[PDB]
Design a protein around this ligand. Structure first.
Ligand code: ZN
Ligand code: ZN
Ligand code: ZN
Ligand code: ZN
Ligand code: ZN
Ligand code: ZN
Lengths: 517, 511, 509
């Protein structure tokens, strides 16, 4: 751990991380539907659909072990409510023991097979009923048909949206969290091995979200690397933080040039998880770690640049650290995973690197900088050369690289590039089981000639092709010569603009990829 | 002298190639009335047809090879046309039964080749040299060139052939034969062309050098090395001496840089008696970020702003030629106020009032107009030397792209005789330059309410003329001229510098 | 001939006053030798001090004891000669009559430029606009040649006159005291003719586009030719279609006003030994077409002056028609139209054919000035002239090259360029020679048409446009004056009438 430099004594010297969230205190109990439901204290919610009939009537098909509540939930009373996706209603009644209970439902539409987006819409309605109410238990009854991955996704998303980050509130606050969660589902014994898997995947996403949402005066190269050391110490992971003196010896000129104009020294994070049984799989995960992207002398001054959001330019690093928690907790075997990130800050200063400067990567390649705001591929280039030297089988990088993703895939799907069938297909398969959507995009070799520099070995940016995401992959491909490599561009999907919060995108996708090899 | 670094990987010197492959070519001129000999790689005939639109190229020189003479017969060559730039390659056996290659370049139908057309002819010639591994090239001038145009042919041949590879990491011909009429009168142009070539290429090397390599300290380090490799008196002025000369305008521009200001002062003096004292001043901004007036506009071209020291490179490139040819009855001072215009907590602000070394207070209206601030203090320094002519050359205003464009430089001045000395030098050096006026009506728009003078105007959008009006206030009695090369310095199509200004200044000193 | 209207309240003619109050001013020039008489009105001394911001010193004998005491060196030293500074006082003369005496500072330079002269007049006109005088007397204590003396009169008359045609007490005598008075006398009535030619063109330019349209401008051109007795013929759409003027007719395709080609002719009484064709760009309103002037800085609100070249040409027709030069034939041409946005407008990318058969690829509809001039230049060349001179507000790049003071001249014959420069010296309308750089010609090579209308790489629009017009003059000495930056006086919010006096001096010599 290094000392965080400060301009004034009021500058923060560490990122606040919440490890023991109220989600961790929720006792989760799952029961089988073929045994009846017991309407207890708190709120009991039914997940109901109606296949074929758009906005069809509500019909409860589960045995309720209460004569009074069964009379309330009869077909001749559900009738006036429909199953439109996202609709919710509250019921108040008295049970057989003359006790007042609260019951309700959330409509799951028709369609029968709900997408990840549709399930989020259902979960958001569920959270609205959990909000502004002081319940001690919530019970969810699954009268919709879901597989194991979608059931785990339901719990992960519910935990994540229910959780509220108040680390930076002072004068502001309000009300409490439920202490128990009940789940009724057919074949319940098969679904509940996913419960504690969902709790692990939740915190990894929330931990990544905590690091992303942390501003750049809190989350800087020094404090971000310190948090990775702190996380590795709790999970007993091997760790090494590379300082400038070691990065100078490794000749990481591309990575070092980006951080020249920062008051925080560059810090390269290298975490390692090793298995007990002999290792038959070696994987290196690389994340872009720019704690703040001012753009450099190519300053983000255009209206659409969204510079006030550029604290999220380390979303790739947070996704890898979130994976380090999930992998470090569940402990898969026969794998070595290397969690890497070249962390720095891209600022404007007398010491900053200039547009037009020619820099040398750690593999000997010289690069002519055409735009200082394209610093991601420069830091990733040195990180990929470092990653390949570790002798791994797969290299997967994740980065908020290009704003062009907002104009290609948008805010819902991330893009994956690569040089190999199966690493892309294994990543695409992991997107299916993790329910984090990713789309395969091409590396068009015709654009490679536009990176031909007149003086340096290669140009950092193209001079003609406006497809920045594809050109960046072509540039990064030049720094992986022999290893299977894939690249995930999450620049469009990392931040939830409507909810004004991070998504923690990549944690579950990367973890599922490690666990399925 | 020591280059500061942020990290240990920051370079501390500009890589400079002094012995280029062009210097290894033995250039050899023969008279065309005597026959051409064929026996090597590539032989090229320069052919025209004055009158016929794209008429047939006609071989007129006697070739001392029976078989190659039969190939070049009029009933044979007929097919090919003379269109300016066209080229074809031939293979055949000579009188010694050895395999040879011959070709031609079309030179159009204009008996006097234009000074831009000869560039197109040279570029066509270079294409045959690039994808080829030839050992010797022979050029037969079957077209009219005067002595100045012939030197230009070699200079353009030398410069375009040469390849800049100082920043690459992860063959050239050895003999050049020229068959030309009255070869004895052109012979003296061979070594003058090679000297002009390297001066231009040495300037291109400084311009193409990026800003992390080419900084105020490393650029002045190259100047003392060049002054030492030649034999000019040299002194580099550091911040401490510039403060005592009270050059506040120049010091304010470099305030926000991590590199200290360095003022270059080279001097060549003649052995005999001196009848002319000349000061050549070059704007030396190693990198122009624009300051707090940051170049963020779309057409700002921030990635090319390493070229804002091209005027300094033009002065140093001319210093090599002068230091080599050693003209007489002349004293030349090579001046440049070298610094870097950065954004920092130490940078100077829009609205700041600064004082030049001649006492005039300047209200800064735009930090991107930093070149005239460094030039102003350099002009006061130049006039203090007691010279007869002061010529400054600068990539001053981007408005040159919309006035004269990328081909013609603009010249301003307060003395029309000096302008014709520059315009005459532009003609013989073959670097085109057009005379533009200093319109005195715009001078009132530089009237500052609080300082002595405004740095920029607010009403007049003719920045090239307004900037010249600003510099004119800092030359009190000496004849002065100003060359604005902001539009012609960089060759955008070739993605490399032109080295513009080296030969124009050398021809100005030599005549 | 009949102006079309959208509504019955749309104007159908441009208003012109031919009889201005300036024409009623009796001008008398006296020699400073023998003393000055200060009886009535306002008397102003034009004084310099060759130092900087030096004191005022009157050196002329005043034939009034009371006014002489006011002009004593001790009393006048409290005022300075800063260029533009002025003070005027009211006092009693020897006859106890109310008189006004003052000065206008002319700096510390002996030879005044045309811009310095403009500044001196502006101070004089401001004093005339705030006083109710019957006579103005100017005492010349500075050196001016006969051209600058005439330029002083033209500029004084032009700035003094106020255009009130769109709105809803001038002096009656002008006295001038100057050493060597007998040589300057002949310039008085030439300045009055030069003044109105400039003021006439200003009236056409300042007239808004709803008043000045292709029909009403050509109608006004016919009226001027009838008042002067010049030949006139106006080409309609049917005749322009027979001449195959595809470039000129394409620009006006989207306008509600039909195209009108102005062709005026002056011819001498003696034998003709020189024939000259003057072409003026006459775009009554330039919206830019589908390349609309919408970007910041395009100044779409001022675009009624895109016919300034035509107004300069028609103003030259008045000056020539009045002074009646000899042994010369002058043709005043203008391809008048309007560049608007409509379903009938021509589009970017359209390929059009000029009257000489060349196909043109339109790359920008706002570069319509070179399209109308191209067909106008072909028309002029068929007339068999010695010189073709066109004047146009062609390129906005002129504001960034030469600015608002100097016009740019281009040409294919540097003997004719020399003649126009010389007229710039005598007319005192400043013009600077700019090059036609042939290296840029290749960038006008179209992939599909014979030639491109605009370049896509060279940002030197003033030179590229001159290269385009050069392709339509095969035979004749031709020159081109770009007055886009100098035509409108932004400080005074009014036109300058630029080109009228320059072209007239070119014709007379
Ligand atoms: Zn960036
Ligand atoms: Zn970034
Ligand atoms: Zn600048
Ligand atoms: Zn500059
Ligand atoms: Zn236009
Ligand atoms: Zn126009």
């Amino acid at each position: 751990a290094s000392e965080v430099p400060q301009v004034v004594s009021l500058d923060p010297t560490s990122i606040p991380i919440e490890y023991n969230t109220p989600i961790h205190d929720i006792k989760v109990q799952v029961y089988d539907i073929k045994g009846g439901c017991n309407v207890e204290e708190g709120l009991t919610i039914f997940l109901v659909n109606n296949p074929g009939k758009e906005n069809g009537p509500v019909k409860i098909s589960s045995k309720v072990n209460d004569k009074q509540v069964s009379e309330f939930l009869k077909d001749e009373n559900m009738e006036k409510f429909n199953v439109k996706l996202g609709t919710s209603k509250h019921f108040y009644m008295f049970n057989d023991n003359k006790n007042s209970v609260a019951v309700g439902y959330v409509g799951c539409g028709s369609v029968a097979d709900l997408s990840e987006a549709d399930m989020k819409r259902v979960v958001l309605s569920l959270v609205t009923m959990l909000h502004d109410n002081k319940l001690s238990k919530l019970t969810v009854v699954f009268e919709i048909n879901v597989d194991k991955n979608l059931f785990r996704f339901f719990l992960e998303t519910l935990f994540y949206e229910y959780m509220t980050d108040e680390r930076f509130k002072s004068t502001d606050k309000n009300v409490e969290y439920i202490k128990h969660l009940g789940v009724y589902i057919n074949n319940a014994d098969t679904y509940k091995e996913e419960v504690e898997k969902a709790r692990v995947y939740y915190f990894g996403t929330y931990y990544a979200s905590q690091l992303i949402a942390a501003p750049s005066n809190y989350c800087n190269p020094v404090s971000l690397s310190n948090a990775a050391v702190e996380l590795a110490q709790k999970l007993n992971l091997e760790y090494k933080i590379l300082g400038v003196k070691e990065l100078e010896e490794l000749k990481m000129g591309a990575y070092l040039s980006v951080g020249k104009g920062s008051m925080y020294p560059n810090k390269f994070i290298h975490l390692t998880y090793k298995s007990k049984g002999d290792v038959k799989k070696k994987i290196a995960l690389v994340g872009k770690g720019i704690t703040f992207d001012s753009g450099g002398y190519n300053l983000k001054a255009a209206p659409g640049s969204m510079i006030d959001l550029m604290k999220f330019d380390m979303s790739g690093c947070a996704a890898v650290l979130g994976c380090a928690y999930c992998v470090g907790t569940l402990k898969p075997e026969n794998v070595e995973i290397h969690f890497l990130s070249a962390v720095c800050e891209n600022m404007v200063s007398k010491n900053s690197y200039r547009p037009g400067d020619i820099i040398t990567a750690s593999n000997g390649k010289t690069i002519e900088v055409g735009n200082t705001d394209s610093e991601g591929r420069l830091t990733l280039a040195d990180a990929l050369v470092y990653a390949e030297k570790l002798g791994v089988d797969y290299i997967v990088d994740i980065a908020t690289l290009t704003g062009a993703m907002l104009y290609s895939l948008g805010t819902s799907y991330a893009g994956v590039f690569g040089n190999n069938e199966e690493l892309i297909n294994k990543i695409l398969q992991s997107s299916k089981t993790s329910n984090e959507p990713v789309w395969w995009l091409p590396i068009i070799n015709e654009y490679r000639a536009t990176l031909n520099s007149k003086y340096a070995d290669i140009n950092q940016i193209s001079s003609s092709v406006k497809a920045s995401s594809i050109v960046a992959s072509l540039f990064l491909k030049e720094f992986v010569q022999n290893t299977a490599w894939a690249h995930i561009d999450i620049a469009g999907v990392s931040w939830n603009f409507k909810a004004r919060k991070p998504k923690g995108f990549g944690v579950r996708l990367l973890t599922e990829f490690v666990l399925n090899d």
